[PDB]
Amino acid sequence: VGLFLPEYNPALTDYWQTLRLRLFNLRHNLSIDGQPLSLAIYAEPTDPK
Amino acid sequence: AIKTTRLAEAIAGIQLYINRALNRIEPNARADVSTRQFFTDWTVNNRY
User: Fold this and answer.
1) Which of A1, A9, A29, B7 has the maximum number of C-beta atoms within 10 A of its C-beta?
2) In chain A, how long is the greatest CA-to-CA distance?
């Protein structure tokens, strides 16, 4: 046998990838574009010597 | 990070269970029960 093999359908893989990305964004408290929805902290340095 | 309330989580859980059972994903669902008036209008009762 030296023939070629069948290929997957790209559209279904695109659906799966989109679903994975959306669920991951939802679970980690991010917007639909990946922008974080929570404010961070600065941890101001405590003066010089 | 994400917060919620007990009633909201219970609502989400029951909605998920109904969605799973109606679409014949979970086997052995009671066919007769799934034809009630409430479930017939599930297109409008699945959101608060």
Assistant:
1) A29
2) 77
Q: Residue B42: which of B18, B26, B13 has the closest Cα?
A: B18
With H, G, I as helix, E, B as strand and everything else as coil, classify residue A44. Answer: coil
Resolution for the entry shown, Å: 3.4
Experimental method: cryo-EM
CA A21 from centroid of its chain's CA atoms:
5
Asked if A29 reaches chain B (Cβ–Cβ under 8 Å), the answer is yes
Residue type, B28: N
Task: Provide the 8-state DSSP code for A36.
Answer: B
Q: Decide: residue B34, CB within 10 A, 0-12 exposed, 13-18 middle, 19+ buried.
A: middle
CA B6 and chain centroid, separation: 17
* Beta carbons of A33 and A24 less than 8 angstroms apart: no
